[PDB]
Design a protein around this ligand. Structure first.
Ligand SMILES: *[C@@H]1O[C@H](CO)[C@@H](O[C@@H]2O[C@H](CO)[C@@H](O[C@@H]3O[C@H](CO)[C@@H](O)[C@H](O[C@H]4O[C@H](CO)[C@@H](O)[C@H](O)[C@@H]4O)[C@@H]3O)[C@H](O)[C@H]2NC(C)=O)[C@H](O)[C@H]1NC(C)=O
Ligand SMILES: *[C@@H]1O[C@H](CO)[C@@H](O[C@@H]2O[C@H](CO)[C@@H](O)[C@H](O)[C@H]2NC(C)=O)[C@H](O)[C@H]1NC(C)=O
Ligand SMILES: *[C@@H]1O[C@H](CO)[C@@H](O[C@@H]2O[C@H](CO)[C@@H](O)[C@H](O)[C@H]2NC(C)=O)[C@H](O)[C@H]1NC(C)=O
Ligand SMILES: *[C@@H]1O[C@H](CO)[C@@H](O)[C@H](O)[C@H]1NC(C)=O
Ligand SMILES: *[C@@H]1O[C@H](CO)[C@@H](O)[C@H](O)[C@H]1NC(C)=O
Ligand SMILES: *[C@@H]1O[C@H](CO)[C@@H](O)[C@H](O)[C@H]1NC(C)=O
Ligand SMILES: NC[C@H]1N[C@H](CO)[C@H](O)[C@@H]1O
Ligand SMILES: NC[C@H]1N[C@H](CO)[C@H](O)[C@@H]1O
Lengths: 392, 390
C-alpha cells in the first residue's frame, strides 16, 4: 500500500490474544475490554519504555462497539465499557505521544457478532478519520463470496485514502481467501500495509511451530512480495504470557525479526517479567526487524531437527537464526560453512559475527573459508548478526 | 512390592531425558554418559540441598555398559566412560549419603542395543547386589512374547529378593503390555516398587498433557492399586530444562504431588535456575507428594477447559489442584463448592485453605457452605491444602 506508512514493520500493542472478548466488566474488571484498560496500557507503554523501543500503536481489536449503530447509522463505542468515546480515547493516546488502532469487519458482522461495515465502508472510514484513528485492522468474518470479500477490502482501502488521514490498513484478506483460492499477493499488497496469512496465534509453542512451518512451506509465495509499505503478518507476539518457555520466547522474537513481521505485543504490560520485557525491548533485535532495507528473511536449511533462517540487511549485513526443533535432551551442536551464509556475501572477504540471542556475545572475525560452530537449546534459537568486513 | 522399600514415592535423579545416550566423550566430555557426570551430580545433590529436600537416589539409565559381557558372562560398565566400575561409583555415592540406581533390560538387548539380561536374570541380580546397587530400572525392549516379558519381570524381582540386598525395583512392564493386553495391576504391584504406565516424557508441554490425560482416562484402573511399596510412574520431572514455561513446570510439580508419583528429576543440576530449584525443593509440595498415607489422588472434575484433581492426605487433610487447559487469553476464573471437595468431608464444618502453588498464600477459613474462587493461568495450576477444623 503506497500511502507512505509502514516503511518498516509496524510496532505496537494489540489486545486480542491476551484479553479476547471479555465483556464481564462486573466480575472480571481487570481483563474486560474497556477504555480504562487501554488508558492504563498507554500509560505503561510510555512509562515502561515501550514507546522508546519503538512500540507506537495502541490497537483495539474486536468487542469495542455497541450492539448496533446509532441514529445516524454510524458505529458507536459501547456506552458502558467506553463512556467517553473513541475520540476522547484517541485524544488521550495522542497526548501520550502514541497512536490508536481500531477494528472493523468487512462482512455484515464482526467475528464476535458486532456491527459489520458492509454498506458503510465510506461512512465507517470517515467515522474513524474523525475520531482520530491511526490504524485499522479489518477482519473478514461473515462474508458471502470472494467477490464480496475482495471488493470490501479494496473499497475500505480507497475509502480510508479518501478520508485524507494517514491510517495504517491491516488486512486479514489472504487468510480468508482459503478455502476458496490462493491469494494474488500483488493485488493484496496494492491495498494493504500488512496482511494476515495464517491462523490465529495462541499462547503455545505449538502455535509458533505451526506459523513458522507454514511460513517456510509457502515462502516462495510470500517472501518477495514483502517490503516497505507492505508486510506479511504472522500474527501477534505472545512473549510475556504463560505458554512459552524462555527459549521459545527467544525463538519467537528472533524469527519475528527474521521475517520482517509487524511487532504487535499481546500481553499485560502491567504484569510482565523483567526477562520478557528485556527480550521485547532488545534494541539489536528490534533493529534487525526494523532494518531500512525491508527484505524479509527465509528458511535456508532444514534437517536433522535443525532449522537455519537468514535475513539480508542493509550494508551487506545479515541476520542468521538457528532453531533446534528437537524437544528432548540438551543443547545440540550445529556447524555451518560461513560461506554458505548470506548467499556467500556476508563473509566475503570476512565478517564479524555477533550473537544477539539468547545472549549477546562478540564471536570475532570469520574468514570466508571458516566454519561457524554453535550450540542451540531445545526449542531455542541462536540469533547472529554478520557484518561484512575487509579487516582480517 | 513388600520389600520394605518405597514406603513413600522414590525421590532422586535419572539421567535419561536430559542426557539420553550421549557416548561422544571426545566432543562433549561434560555431557556424555560417564562416571564423571554422575560424580558431579552427586556432589551437587549434596551441595545444593537436593539430599536435604528428599532426593536420595542417583540413578543410571541406559548406555552405561560395555558392548558385551566379560569372561564370566557378567555385565560390565564401559571401560572408558566408567573406568573405576559401578561398585566404586556406588562407594562414592554412598560416601555422599546417597543411593545408586542402575539400568537393565528384561529382553535380549537394552533399548540402546547393549547386553540384555534375558538368560542372566540371577547372574545380573547378584552382580548388582555385589556392586552395591540400591535401585534397578528394568526396561522391556527386545522381548519375544508377553509370557517372556511377565516371566522375566517376576524372575528378576525374585532374584533381587534372593540377593538379600534392599534394592528398589522399578519396572516398565505395564507400558510394554499395552496395546497387546490389559495389565493386571495387582499382579504388577506384587512384584514392583513402581511401574511405568505411559510413553516416555520429553521436554514439552504436549508430553505432560498426554501423560495427565492418559492417567485421568485410566484412573479407575490404576489409582486404588497404588500405595506404600507400589506406585504409578508417570515418568521423570523435566523442570529446569528448556521446553516448559514456568506455569507448565508448576503444573508438573503440583500434579506429580497429587499423583503420588516418584519424583525423578532429569535435568542438569550444574546449570539450573533459582526458580526451578526453588520449585523442585518446595517443602510443602514435597510433603504432599511424600504423604505417609500414600493414597494417590485423582481427577475429580473436567470441563470448560478446567481440571480439578484432589488427593486425600494424613490427618483429614486434602490436596486440591486446579488446571487451566485453555492455552489462550489470560488468568481464568474458576469457582467450586467447597463441599464438593474431599468427598464432602474436607470442609465440614469448616476448613482452612492454604494455596501452595504458584505462590504460597493463606486463603483463610471456608465454611461447608462456601465456594472457592480462584484465577488459574493458562497451562498453569493452582495447588491448595485443605486442613479440616476437626
Ligand atoms: C492516497 O493514495 C495515493 C496513491 O494512490 C498516495 O500517494 C502517494 O503518496 C506517497 C507517500 O507520500 C508518495 O511517495 C512519495 O513521493 C514523493 C514524491 O516523489 C517523495 O517525496 C517521497 O519520498 C520520501 O518518502 C519515501 C517513503 O514513501 C522514501 O522512500 C523517500 O526516500 C523519501 O523519504 C515518496 O516517494 C507517492 O508518490 C504517492 N503516489 C501517488 C500516485 O500520488 C497518498 O499518499 C494517499 N493518501 C492517503 C491520505 O492515504
Ligand atoms: C524378600 O521378600 C520378603 C517377603 O515379601 C520380604 O519380607 C517382608 O519384609 C517387610 C520389611 O518391612 C516386612 O514388613 C514383611 O512382613 C516381610 N514379609 C514376609 C512374608 O516376610 C523381604 O523384605 C524381602 N527382602 C528383600 C531383600 O527384598
Ligand atoms: C491378578 O493377579 C493376582 C495374583 O497375581 C490375582 O490374585 C490372586 O488370585 C488367586 C485366584 O485363586 C488367589 O488364590 C490369590 O490369593 C490372589 N492373590 C492376590 C495377591 O490377590 C488376581 O485375581 C488377578 N486379577 C485378575 C483380574 O485376574
Ligand atoms: C448482508 O446481508 C444482506 C441481506 O441478507 C445481504 O444481501 C448482503 O450480501 C450481506 N452482506 C455481506 C457482505 O454478505
Ligand atoms: C494480481 O493482481 C494484479 C492487480 O490486481 C494484476 O495486475 C495481476 O495480473 C494479478 N496476478 C495474477 C497472477 O492474477
Ligand atoms: C532371544 O533370542 C533367542 C534366539 O533368537 C530366542 O530364542 C529367545 O527367545 C530370545 N529371548 C527374548 C526374551 O526375546
Ligand atoms: N482471524 C480472526 C480474527 N477475529 C478476531 C476478532 O474477533 C481476531 O481479530 C482474529 O485476528
Ligand atoms: N520406555 C523406554 C525406555 N528406554 C530408555 C532407555 O533406553 C529409557 O529407559 C526409556 O524410559
Amino acid at each position: 500500500l503506497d500511502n507512505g506508512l509502514a516503511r518498516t514493520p509496524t510496532m505496537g500493542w494489540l489486545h486480542w490474544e491476551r484479553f479476547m472478548c471479555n465483556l464481564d466488566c462486573q466480575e472480571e474488571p481487570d481483563s474486560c475490554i474497556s477504555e480504562k484498560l487501554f488508558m492504563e496500557m498507554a500509560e505503561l507503554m510510555v512509562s515502561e519504555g515501550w514507546k522508546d523501543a519503538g512500540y507506537e500503536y495502541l490497537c483495539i481489536d474486536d468487542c469495542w462497539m455497541a450492539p448496533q449503530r446509532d441514529s445516524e447509522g454510524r458505529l458507536q463505542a459501547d456506552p458502558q465499557r467506553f463512556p467517553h468515546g473513541i475520540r476522547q480515547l484517541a485524544n488521550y493516546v495522542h497526548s501520550k505521544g502514541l497512536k490508536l488502532g481500531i477494528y472493523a469487519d468487512v462482512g455484515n458482522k464482526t467475528c464476535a457478532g458486532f456491527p459489520g461495515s458492509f454498506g458503510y465502508y465510506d461512512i465507517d472510514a470517515q467515522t474513524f478519520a474523525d475520531w482520530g484513528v491511526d490504524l485499522l485492522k479489518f477482519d473478514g468474518c461473515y462474508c458471502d463470496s470472494l467477490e464480496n470479500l475482495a471488493d470490501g477490502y479494496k473499497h475500505m482501502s480507497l475509502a480510508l485514502n479518501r478520508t485524507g488521514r494517514s491510517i495504517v490498513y491491516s488486512c486479514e484478506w489472504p487468510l480468508y481467501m482459503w478455502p476458496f483460492q490462493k491469494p494474488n499477493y500483488t493485488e493484496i499488497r496494492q491495498y494493504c500495509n500488512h496482511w494476515r496469512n495464517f491462523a490465529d496465534i495462541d499462547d503455545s509453542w505449538k502455535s509458533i511451530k505451526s506459523i513458522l512451518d507454514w511460513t517456510s512451506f509457502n515462502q516462495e509465495r510470500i517472501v518477495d512480495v514483502a517490503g516497505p509499505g507492505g508486510w506479511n503478518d504472522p500474527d501477534m507476539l505472545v512473549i510475556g504470557n504463560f505458554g512459552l518457555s524462555w527459549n521459545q520466547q527467544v525463538t519467537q522474537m528472533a524469527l519475528w525479526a527474521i521475517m520482517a513481521a509487524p511487532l504487535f505485543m499481546s500481553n499485560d504490560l502491567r504484569h510482565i517479567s523483567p526477562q520478557a520485557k528485556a527480550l521485547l525491548q532488545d534494541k539489536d533485535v528490534i533493529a534487525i526487524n526494523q532494518d531500512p532495507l525491508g527484505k524479509q528473511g527465509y528458511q535456508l536449511r532444514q534437517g536433522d531437527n535443525f532449522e537455519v533462517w537468514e535475513r539480508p540487511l542493509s550494508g551487506l549485513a545479515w541476520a542468521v537464526a538457528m532453531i533446534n526443533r528437537q524437544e528432548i535432551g540438551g543443547p545440540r551442536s550445529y556447524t555451518i560453512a560461513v560461506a554458505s551464509l548470506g548467499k556467500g556475501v556476508a563473509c566475503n572477504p570476512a565478517c564479524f559475527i555477533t550473537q544477539l540471542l539468547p545472549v549477546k556475545r562478540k564471536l570475532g572475525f570469520y574468514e570466508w573459508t571458516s566454519r561457524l560452530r554453535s550450540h542451540i537449546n531445545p526449542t531455542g534459537t541462536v540469533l547472529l548478526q554478520l557484518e561484512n568486513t575487509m579487516q582480517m
